[PDB]
Amino acid sequence: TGAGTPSQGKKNTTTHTKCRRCGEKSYHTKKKVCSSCGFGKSAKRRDYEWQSKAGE
Amino acid sequence: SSGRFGARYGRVSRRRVAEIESEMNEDHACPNCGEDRVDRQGTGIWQCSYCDYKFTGGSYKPETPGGKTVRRS
Amino acid sequence: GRRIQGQRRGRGTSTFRAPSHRYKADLEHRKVEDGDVIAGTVVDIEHDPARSAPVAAVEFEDGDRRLILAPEGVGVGDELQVGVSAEIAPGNTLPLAEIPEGVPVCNVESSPGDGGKFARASGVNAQLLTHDRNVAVVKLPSGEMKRLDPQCRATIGVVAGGGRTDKPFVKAGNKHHKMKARGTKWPNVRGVAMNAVDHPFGGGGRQHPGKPKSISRNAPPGRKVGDIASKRTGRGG
RNA sequence: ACGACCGUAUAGUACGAGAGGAACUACGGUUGGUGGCCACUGGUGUACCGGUUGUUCGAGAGAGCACGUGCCGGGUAGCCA
RNA sequence: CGAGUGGCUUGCUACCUCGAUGUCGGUUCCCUCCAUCCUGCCCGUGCAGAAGCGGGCAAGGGUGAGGUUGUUCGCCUAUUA
RNA sequence: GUCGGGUGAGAACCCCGACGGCCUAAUGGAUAAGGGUUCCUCAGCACUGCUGAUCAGCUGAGGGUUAGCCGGUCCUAAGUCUCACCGCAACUCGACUGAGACGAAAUGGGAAACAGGUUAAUAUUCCUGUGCCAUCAUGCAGUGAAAGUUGACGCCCUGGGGUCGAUCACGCCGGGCAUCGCCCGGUCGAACCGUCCAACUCCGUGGAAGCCGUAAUGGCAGGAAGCGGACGAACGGCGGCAUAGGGAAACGUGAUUCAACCUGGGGCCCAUGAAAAGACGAGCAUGAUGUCCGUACCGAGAACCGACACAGGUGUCCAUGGCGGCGAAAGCCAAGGCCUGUCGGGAGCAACCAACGUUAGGGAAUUCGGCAAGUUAGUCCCGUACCUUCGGAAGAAGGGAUGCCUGCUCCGGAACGGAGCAGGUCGCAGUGACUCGGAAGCUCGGACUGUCUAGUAACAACAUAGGUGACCGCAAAUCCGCAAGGACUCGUACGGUCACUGAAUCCUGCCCAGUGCAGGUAUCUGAACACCUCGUACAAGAGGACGAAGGACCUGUCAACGGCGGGGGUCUUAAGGUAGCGUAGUACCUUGCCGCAUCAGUAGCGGCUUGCAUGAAUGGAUUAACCAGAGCUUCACUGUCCCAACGUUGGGCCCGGUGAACUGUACAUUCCAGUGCGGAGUCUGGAGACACCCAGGGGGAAGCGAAGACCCUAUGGAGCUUUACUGCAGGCUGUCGCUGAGGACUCUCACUCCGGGAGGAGGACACCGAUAGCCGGGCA
RNA sequence: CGUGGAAGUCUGUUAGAGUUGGUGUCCUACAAUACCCUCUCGUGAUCUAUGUGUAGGGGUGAAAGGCCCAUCGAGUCCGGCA
Ligand SMILES: COC(=O)C[C@](O)(CCCC(C)(C)O)C(=O)O[C@@H]1C(OC)=C[C@]23CCCN2CCc2cc4c(cc2[C@H]13)OCO4
Ligand SMILES: [Cl-]
Ligand SMILES: [Cl-]
Ligand SMILES: [Cl-]
Ligand SMILES: [K+]
Ligand SMILES: [Mg+2]
Ligand SMILES: [Mg+2]
Ligand SMILES: [Mg+2]
Ligand SMILES: [Mg+2]
Ligand SMILES: [Mg+2]
Ligand SMILES: [Mg+2]
Ligand SMILES: [Mg+2]
Ligand SMILES: [Mg+2]
Ligand SMILES: [Mg+2]
Ligand SMILES: [Mg+2]
Ligand SMILES: [Mg+2]
Ligand SMILES: [Mg+2]
Ligand SMILES: [Mg+2]
Ligand SMILES: [Mg+2]
Ligand SMILES: [Mg+2]
Ligand SMILES: [Mg+2]
Ligand SMILES: [Mg+2]
Ligand SMILES: [Mg+2]
Ligand SMILES: [Mg+2]
Ligand SMILES: [Mg+2]
Ligand SMILES: [Mg+2]
Ligand SMILES: [Mg+2]
Ligand SMILES: [Mg+2]
Ligand SMILES: [Mg+2]
Ligand SMILES: [Mg+2]
Ligand SMILES: [Mg+2]
Ligand SMILES: [Mg+2]
Ligand SMILES: [Mg+2]
Ligand SMILES: [Mg+2]
Ligand SMILES: [Mg+2]
Ligand SMILES: [Mg+2]
Ligand SMILES: [Mg+2]
Ligand SMILES: [Mg+2]
Ligand SMILES: [Mg+2]
Ligand code: NA
Ligand code: NA
Ligand code: NA
Ligand code: NA
Ligand code: NA
Ligand code: NA
Ligand code: NA
Ligand code: NA
Ligand code: NA
Ligand code: NA
Ligand code: NA
Ligand code: NA
Ligand code: NA
Ligand code: NA
Ligand code: NA
Ligand code: NA
Ligand code: NA
Ligand SMILES: [Sr+2]
Ligand SMILES: [Sr+2]
Ligand SMILES: [Sr+2]
Ligand SMILES: [Sr+2]
Ligand SMILES: [Sr+2]
Ligand SMILES: [Sr+2]
Ligand SMILES: [Sr+2]
Ligand SMILES: [Sr+2]
Ligand SMILES: [Sr+2]
Ligand SMILES: [Sr+2]
Ligand SMILES: [Sr+2]
Ligand SMILES: [Sr+2]
Ligand SMILES: [Sr+2]
Ligand SMILES: [Sr+2]
Ligand SMILES: [Sr+2]
Ligand SMILES: [Sr+2]
Ligand SMILES: [Sr+2]
Ligand SMILES: [Sr+2]
Numbered sequence A: 001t002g003a004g005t006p007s008q009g010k011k012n013t014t015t016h017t018k019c020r021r022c023g024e025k026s027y028h029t030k031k032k033v034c035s036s037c038g039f040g041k042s043a044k045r046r047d048y049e050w051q052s053k054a055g056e
Numbered sequence B: 001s002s003g004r005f006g007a008r009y010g011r012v013s014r015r016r017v018a019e020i021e022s023e024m025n026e027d028h029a030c031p032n033c034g035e036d037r038v039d040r041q042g043t044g045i046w047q048c049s050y051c052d053y054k055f056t057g058g059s060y061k062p063e064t065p066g067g068k069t070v071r072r073s
Numbered sequence C: 001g002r003r004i005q006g007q008r009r010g011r012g013t014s015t016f017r018a019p020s021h022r023y024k025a026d027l028e029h030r031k032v033e034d035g036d037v038i039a040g041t042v043v044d045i046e047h048d049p050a051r052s053a054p055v056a057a058v059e060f061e062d063g064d065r066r067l068i069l070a071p072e073g074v075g076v077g078d079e080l081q082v083g084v085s086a087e088i089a090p091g092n093t094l095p096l097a098e099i100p101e102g103v104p105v106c107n108v109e110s111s112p113g114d115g116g117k118f119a120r121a122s123g124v125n126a127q128l129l130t131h132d133r134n135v136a137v138v139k140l141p142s143g144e145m146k147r148l149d150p151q152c153r154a155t156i157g158v159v160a161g162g163g164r165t166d167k168p169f170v171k172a173g174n175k176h177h178k179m180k181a182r183g184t185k186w187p188n189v190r191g192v193a194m195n196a197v198d199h200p201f202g203g204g205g206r207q208h209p210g211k212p213k214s215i216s217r218n219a220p221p222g223r224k225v226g227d228i229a230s231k232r233t234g235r236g237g
Numbered sequence D: 001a002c003g004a005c006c007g008u009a010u011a012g013u014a015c016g017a018g019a020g021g022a023a024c025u026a027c028g029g030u031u032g033g034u035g036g037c038c039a040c041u042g043g044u045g046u047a048c049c050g051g052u053u054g055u056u057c058g059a060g061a062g063a064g065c066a067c068g069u070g071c072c073g074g075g076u077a078g079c080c081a
Numbered sequence E: 001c002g003a004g005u006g007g008c009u010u011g012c013u014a015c016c017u018c019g020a021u022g023u024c025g026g027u028u029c030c031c032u033c034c035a036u037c038c039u040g041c042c043c044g045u046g047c048a049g050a051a052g053c054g055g056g057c058a059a060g061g062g063u064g065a066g067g068u069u070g071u072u073c074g075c076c077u078a079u080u081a
Numbered sequence F: 001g002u003c004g005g006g007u008g009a010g011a012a013c014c015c016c017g018a019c020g021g022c023c024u025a026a027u028g029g030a031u032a033a034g035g036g037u038u039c040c041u042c043a044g045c046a047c048u049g050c051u052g053a054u055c056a057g058c059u060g061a062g063g064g065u066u067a068g069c070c071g072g073u074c075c076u077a078a079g080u081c082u083c084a085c086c087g088c089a090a091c092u093c094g095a096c097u098g099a100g101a102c103g104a105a106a107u108g109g110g111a112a113a114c115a116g117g118u119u120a121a122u123a124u125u126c127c128u129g130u131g132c133c134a135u136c137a138u139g140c141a142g143u144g145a146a147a148g149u150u151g152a153c154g155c156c157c158u159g160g161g162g163u164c165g166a167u168c169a170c171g172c173c174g175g176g177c178a179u180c181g182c183c184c185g186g187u188c189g190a191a192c193c194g195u196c197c198a199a200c201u202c203c204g205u206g207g208a209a210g211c212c213g214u215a216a217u218g219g220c221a222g223g224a225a226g227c228g229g230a231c232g233a234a235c236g237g238c239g240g241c242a243u244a245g246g247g248a249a250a251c252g253u254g255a256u257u258c259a260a261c262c263u264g265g266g267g268c269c270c271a272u273g274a275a276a277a278g279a280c281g282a283g284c285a286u287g288a289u290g291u292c293c294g295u296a297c298c299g300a301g302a303a304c305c306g307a308c309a310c311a312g313g314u315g316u317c318c319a320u321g322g323c324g325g326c327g328a329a330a331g332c333c334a335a336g337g338c339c340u341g342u343c344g345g346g347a348g349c350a351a352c353c354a355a356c357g358u359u360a361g362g363g364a365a366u367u368c369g370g371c372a373a374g375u376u377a378g379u380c381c382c383g384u385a386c387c388u389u390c391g392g393a394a395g396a397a398g399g400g401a402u403g404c405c406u407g408c409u410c411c412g413g414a415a416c417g418g419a420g421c422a423g424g425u426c427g428c429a430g431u432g433a434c435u436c437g438g439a440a441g442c443u444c445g446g447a448c449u450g451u452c453u454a455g456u457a458a459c460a461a462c463a464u465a466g467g468u469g470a471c472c473g474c475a476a477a478u479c480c481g482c483a484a485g486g487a488c489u490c491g492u493a494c495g496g497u498c499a500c501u502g503a504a505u506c507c508u509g510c511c512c513a514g515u516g517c518a519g520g521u522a523u524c525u526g527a528a529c530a531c532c533u534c535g536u537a538c539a540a541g542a543g544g545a546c547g548a549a550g551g552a553c554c555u556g557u558c559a560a561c562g563g564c565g566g567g568g569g570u571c572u573u574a575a576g577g578u579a580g581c582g583u584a585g586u587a588c589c590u591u592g593c594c595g596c597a598u599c600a601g602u603a604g605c606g607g608c609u610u611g612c613a614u615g616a617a618u619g620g621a622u623u624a625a626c627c628a629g630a631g632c633u634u635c636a637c638u639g640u641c642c643c644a645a646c647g648u649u650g651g652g653c654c655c656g657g658u659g660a661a662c663u664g665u666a667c668a669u670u671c672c673a674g675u676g677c678g679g680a681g682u683c684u685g686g687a688g689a690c691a692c693c694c695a696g697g698g699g700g701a702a703g704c705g706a707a708g709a710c711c712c713u714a715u716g717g718a719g720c721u722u723u724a725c726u727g728c729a730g731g732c733u734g735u736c737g738c739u740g741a742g743g744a745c746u747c748u749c750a751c752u753c754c755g756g757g758a759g760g761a762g763g764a765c766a767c768c769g770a771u772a773g774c775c776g777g778g779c780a
Numbered sequence G: 001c002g003u004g005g006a007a008g009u010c011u012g013u014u015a016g017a018g019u020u021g022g023u024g025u026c027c028u029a030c031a032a033u034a035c036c037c038u039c040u041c042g043u044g045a046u047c048u049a050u051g052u053g054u055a056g057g058g059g060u061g062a063a064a065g066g067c068c069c070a071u072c073g074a075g076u077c078c079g080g081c082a
């Protein structure tokens, strides 16, 4: 079985969904954690300094 | 009794299974009565079809050489 | 390199864990104050998935249904006694002081009241030898003379399920089934059959170990493989 | 677009003590190559005709499907060696 | 011992290509060279004949089938002008 | 697909009919996920649709999903999260322990619904009829009430009960066919309420010393059969339900085999096969309440994933439609679906190509190699070698039979089950298609089933049982974490950790010098702290004494890394190659020599064998069985070949429509020679050359595709190794702190562990913090 | 002689799993691993759906440096970074 086209057929699982906190389709319905805002992981909003260039 | 193993496994592997299963499916004397009606239920578990006596013995023998030494002292 | 198999073990992941949820009972001795007036009738003989030997279901006088480590020759209907003034019969639990010398014993405690540590596997037994006011010398299944406290409880008789090791597994499938009930990753790939990145004995154009197999005690995890602190190796000499 | 070989007559002759043994020439054929052709032999021939198994159309009759003929037997023209 | 010709072998060189000129052997199809294996015509002979040996002209045609081996090469078999 | 016809400005492909086809575990029916309006209606063709379109999953506008009893919801599973606690410099980090919550929509558990009718679209939801459950209220009953049962369970074999279906018999209703009189369809009717009960178990009677019983095991004076009885099943029978429903009508009755469902018997485990909520236990009437969420449609060669209306991928149930046959096989045909695996028209339709049929004679001559193809084939009877681990080899091999028709026999209760007999008879051919092994031998490897490089390797590699060695008594060995802590472990030496070898059988020699590990050690060496001397009004610093692990030294150990030679009738460096095997998958020489086989054999097999450079768990030898593993031989077979031909289907070619890409410095009709950075269509000299177009097979453009993976170079990168350099973890060990009382010792009060507790073990040690020495490719 | 019905047992395109050869077809594909025939396994170390766990010098690995979303001798994203 090839890792390409024939392995894409098994993809009918729902993981990332619309988030209650931020509205992005990043709420992992199995982990109960948002990959965008950090809902379910932290009270503080997920933000990092590397999301922009160092002097900006 | 190792004819289920066919032409596979070798002498020692299927000769030692034959000896151990011949002395397991054999008629054993019961500790309650005296009848030769003790059969195996599982690993170490033995039972008599006469008086419903379910007991502990060896894995394949209802009495081990070390189990008979306990009766002495 | 990459962490060796023995290092992945300690992380306690699913593959290395025992199927605890499929296990029956933690076979410990009963908690009596002092008096011996605790006895019970054997209700059933069950198979223990953790030790591949039988375990006796006993119901006590006060109404406690507990699974006990079954010795050889214990059946349904039989009465077992647990306490200081208990009868010297096979299947009874009483401290080493009260048990006579030269009698094969099993499920021996290390520190009094722990519930039993030694001589628990199929068909084995500990031999009680010397008595004193201070010490009870017990000969464990390995042949070691263990000096123990006479207040350590133990069950009379050899453990049930003797001779298990006598019959060969014959086929890999039988081993598979036994191993699926234990806390072990099976099958075993030889280190000598691996890549250098995976094991100290891995690599080469042919299969042979790198350096010698006898490793020092002071060796770190990732290097402690082969013959750990061997006093000697081989059969002859 | 022809190349080459074998055989017969020459001749058991010339030559040679003998053993052995030619040629010119005239013939017949073979092989390789070449071009063409199908009366003859052969192949094909899901044109065609027949036999026959399974199943469906109620039976019969007569048919469909079974890979582009179900299978088997015969095979015209043409195309071919 | 001396003088050469070729450019099939091998060696030497590092001129050409490293923003790639697809490596051996085989096969298939075409052209060519002559230092000619056969075939045509010749000269010599330690040329009687027969069968050969050596040499000259000559590249029209031919130079095939097989056993081991990936083999080129080579060894081997039976045919062959 | 074709002929008619319908609609329309327009029709090959939108619709109707007919004729002809395709799909049968799917191309049918119901669904999970996933999609998200794709569903229905109307209006459309700018877009999308492999051509066209009046059609549409497209465009626009409207409309559509109705529940006490179908799911969710509730329960708990592997497991997840939250809070508390503790750790961490710290946290959104982290293990344990508590408490709480979360965790199952086809497919775990679970209170209760069936039949019909209706819509363009929903339907166990709406409507009609009938029924059922839970809670609460009232009334009667009841004082029981919680023990117990259920929920609730593995794999293999099997009996009994039994429905749908299928088939057989006969009858009724309707249809079809028309030499017959056969063929098809239907002949209905639920939930629920009531009732019946086989199996199991048990009780009374009885009294077997050999009987009872089974498909099989089995049962019994500790009481068999027989007799009577208690308890007790179906989604089953029976009655109601039903002058309900449904049908144009009839609106059946018996039978066999029997999925579902019910209920038993047996066997296996170094394997032991969930839990909880809930229910039962525990009556009846009447009345009330039963909210919230899902519900359309697709579920795929066009509704999902794969950029696509993708030949890929994607779970469940229908596994009982007919013939066929062992069959959920083939082939054919129903029900149902479809002509959308969606561009057509034309040319005996050329070459060439893809799939394929048939080829005389020869028969592997082909080729690295029988690659490809072919041969064989189902079933019964006969018959069957070497070898062998006695299982097997084995369907060895080889030989014979095989249809139809008439009349029968035997087994069984019987089958529309099976096994046979006699006579008759047709063909080239009777497993007539279909389905359906080619066979034998020698050698190598791995014992076997199994595993693997998703995407060039399926193998001899990995695994395996088996063999072996190592570590550890559990406050362990081994391992994870910075820590708090954790795996192994609901475990305890018949254990489980760490390694090697790789079934069985016969065996497994010699070497401890080096390296490794381990034990010991008079003596030697061996850090810091404290101590002593010198020095400094102190300090830096120099020296001494003491001396841990470690090292030196000694010993043990090779199924520990490994080694098993040269010379002469010892030397290096410990030993000096034993059984075996041997020109090997190891042998350079080498196509070794002899033999076998062939016309011929670098092959293969046997023998020899001085072995360039075999050899004993770096396991040696050997070996039955097994194998999409490597090599060789024989029979059979054949288009692999001699040597090619003809045919079949789809392309190719012409026409309508649709309509890319690769590639492009320029010029360009070239050829032969030469020259040039030595491999020129373009320079030089000649030769040839009127332009354009069609088809072709690919000689050239050192053709197109990819800043060569080879090679070197760069004070480039990375992975990996080690007795490279330097360091970092980790282990061992001394010392200081915790830390206390009276070079060896006692104690208990810190501290640790065990114990529910009382209390017990240990104890100034251990743990932990700090520092010092040793080891230290585990890591950087 | 029968009964019994064991087995990492055999035949088998049952379902299902796998992938030996053709070095066939395709190779601006139907397809960034496809098609056809052939072939292997198919009661077990079996296959499979869903839920769940292990995370980057880390997992996972019957070991091929295999696999960890077309990405692996150290995933991916962004940042360091011009
Ligand atoms: C070592 O041999 C190779 O590496 C072969 C190849 O890798 C073939 C490449 C084929 C491609 C990929 C370019 O199609 C290659 O690049 O070859 C070069 C190559 O590739 C273009 C061509 C070369 C360059 C000089 C001519 N020669 C012809 C082929 C060749 C053959 C070789 C050779 C080199 C060449 C080079 O070593 C000996 O065998
Ligand atoms: Cl084990
Ligand atoms: Cl639902
Ligand atoms: Cl039965
Ligand atoms: K080059
Ligand atoms: Mg326990
Ligand atoms: Mg073992
Ligand atoms: Mg496990
Ligand atoms: Mg192994
Ligand atoms: Mg490897
Ligand atoms: Mg490698
Ligand atoms: Mg390493
Ligand atoms: Mg080896
Ligand atoms: Mg080895
Ligand atoms: Mg080229
Ligand atoms: Mg000349
Ligand atoms: Mg010429
Ligand atoms: Mg319309
Ligand atoms: Mg509908
Ligand atoms: Mg389509
Ligand atoms: Mg022929
Ligand atoms: Mg040849
Ligand atoms: Mg073949
Ligand atoms: Mg009869
Ligand atoms: Mg060989
Ligand atoms: Mg194998
Ligand atoms: Mg591969
Ligand atoms: Mg394979
Ligand atoms: Mg082993
Ligand atoms: Mg072992
Ligand atoms: Mg191996
Ligand atoms: Mg030889
Ligand atoms: Mg040895
Ligand atoms: Mg380059
Ligand atoms: Mg290189
Ligand atoms: Mg580097
Ligand atoms: Mg504790
Ligand atoms: Mg390094
Ligand atoms: Mg999973
Ligand atoms: Na020259
Ligand atoms: Na070539
Ligand atoms: Na010539
Ligand atoms: Na040759
Ligand atoms: Na169309
Ligand atoms: Na009933
Ligand atoms: Na049938
Ligand atoms: Na198998
Ligand atoms: Na040594
Ligand atoms: Na050696
Ligand atoms: Na052919
Ligand atoms: Na060309
Ligand atoms: Na690297
Ligand atoms: Na028998
Ligand atoms: Na395949
Ligand atoms: Na296999
Ligand atoms: Na990484
Ligand atoms: Sr999935
Ligand atoms: Sr969280
Ligand atoms: Sr931030
Ligand atoms: Sr405890
Ligand atoms: Sr315990
Ligand atoms: Sr190695
Ligand atoms: Sr020895
Ligand atoms: Sr003559
Ligand atoms: Sr003569
Ligand atoms: Sr036909
Ligand atoms: Sr046939
Ligand atoms: Sr000349
Ligand atoms: Sr000549
Ligand atoms: Sr050459
Ligand atoms: Sr040679
Ligand atoms: Sr459907
Ligand atoms: Sr238009
Ligand atoms: Sr529609």
Ligand SMILES: [Sr+2]
Pocket: none
């Ligand atoms: Sr819940």
Ligand SMILES: [Sr+2]
Pocket: none
């Ligand atoms: Sr359910």
Ligand SMILES: [Sr+2]
Pocket: none
């Ligand atoms: Sr039945």
Ligand SMILES: [Sr+2]
Pocket: none
């Ligand atoms: Sr629906």
Ligand SMILES: [Sr+2]
Pocket: none
């Ligand atoms: Sr599909």
Ligand SMILES: [Sr+2]
Pocket: A006
């Ligand atoms: Sr595929």
Ligand SMILES: [Sr+2]
Pocket: none
């Ligand atoms: Sr039909």
Ligand SMILES: [Sr+2]
Pocket: F342
């Ligand atoms: Sr279309």
Ligand SMILES: [Sr+2]
Pocket: none
């Ligand atoms: Sr014919």
Ligand SMILES: [Sr+2]
Pocket: F364
């Ligand atoms: Sr041959």
Ligand SMILES: [Sr+2]
Pocket: none
């Ligand atoms: Sr040949």
Ligand SMILES: [Sr+2]
Pocket: none
């Ligand atoms: Sr035969």
Ligand SMILES: [Sr+2]
Pocket: A001, F454
């Ligand atoms: Sr795979």
Ligand SMILES: [Sr+2]
Pocket: none
């Ligand atoms: Sr062996």
Ligand SMILES: [Sr+2]
Pocket: F512
């Ligand atoms: Sr040594």
Ligand SMILES: [Sr+2]
Pocket: none
């Ligand atoms: Sr010798």
